[PDB]
Amino acid sequence: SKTSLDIAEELQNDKGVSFAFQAREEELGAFTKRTLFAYSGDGLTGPFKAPASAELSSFLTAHPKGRWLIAFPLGTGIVSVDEGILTLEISRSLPEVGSGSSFYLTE
Amino acid sequence: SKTSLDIAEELQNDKGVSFAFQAREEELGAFTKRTLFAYSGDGLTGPFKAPASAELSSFLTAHPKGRWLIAFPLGTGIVSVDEGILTLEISRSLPEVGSGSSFYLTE
Amino acid sequence: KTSLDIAEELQNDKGVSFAFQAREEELGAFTKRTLFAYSGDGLTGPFKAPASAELSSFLTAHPKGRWLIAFPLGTGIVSVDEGILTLEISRSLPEVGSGSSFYLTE
């Protein structure tokens, strides 16, 4: 059970909302698990959009669905990347985002 | 901290739905944590049933409640095993399952 | 680099039992702190119990001063005041189950 990628970065939009993301990749024999962790202390009225690093973009793009369904305490999000820009869309406005994670396992 | 077990396997039901499960055991001094991770890209209309490996079955049986309450983004499930058949029951039909985990800690 | 990984069991005056695990990890310029919580019990109202010195300072260190946490059937907020942990819940919970709350900081 080896970790082959473990990166973290802070993204911010133009309205001053900020998120921290962590991308982790693990090998488990025949399987690989990829996990995205997300944290913000801010509220979100609508989608969060910000430039992501190339390594984070590459990680995000690799998902079989091409996006990441993610549960936060007060609502549901989908994280995607397009031309190096990360978007997190939310199911309802969130007074506070808090933390969540989203993973897939593949062989 | 030390990991004594970390296994993964893919299960499929008769109607084409597939889940990946990872079972992890960690020792934290006097405590042991056991975590089940579950992922499916598919939707679930009703309960998911499929044969589990002996090692996964033994892991799932060890829970103090004899089953695993698990949150997915769009609803709640309960994972149990009976005679080596894993069943995941869900609180509502799910257009997409996504990922979730369920753990317990014991002394 | 895991720089902290502690676990303890807490019980209230009504025999509800919780296990907590506090983990701190270092990822380059970032620190991640995760609180894991588990109870097999139901919870009618807030859970209060004394926490270790180490668990208390870990819980105090959050930028919001409290930990928003998702469980399968409802939402909680974990906080500490003078070594007493409180977990407040958004609705009564027939069973608590497991959840975790983390933050990532530069």
Residue numbers in the entry:
A (entry chain F), B (entry chain D): 238 to 344
C (entry chain E): 239 to 344
Could you give the paper's own sentences about this structure?
Trimeric fibre proteins protrude from each of the twelve vertices. These fibre proteins have an amino-terminal virus-binding sequence, a central shaft domain, and a globular, carboxy-terminal fibre head domain involved in initial receptor-binding. The SnAdV-1 fibre head is the first Atadenovirus protein structure to be solved at atomic resolution. Despite the low sequence identity with other fibre heads, the topology of the beta-sandwich is identical to that of known adenovirus fibre head structures and contains ABCJ and GHID beta-sheets (the E- and F-strands in the long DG-loop of human adenoviruses 5 and 2 are absent).
When the structures of the fibre head monomer of the different crystal forms are superimposed, no significant differences in main chain conformations were observed.
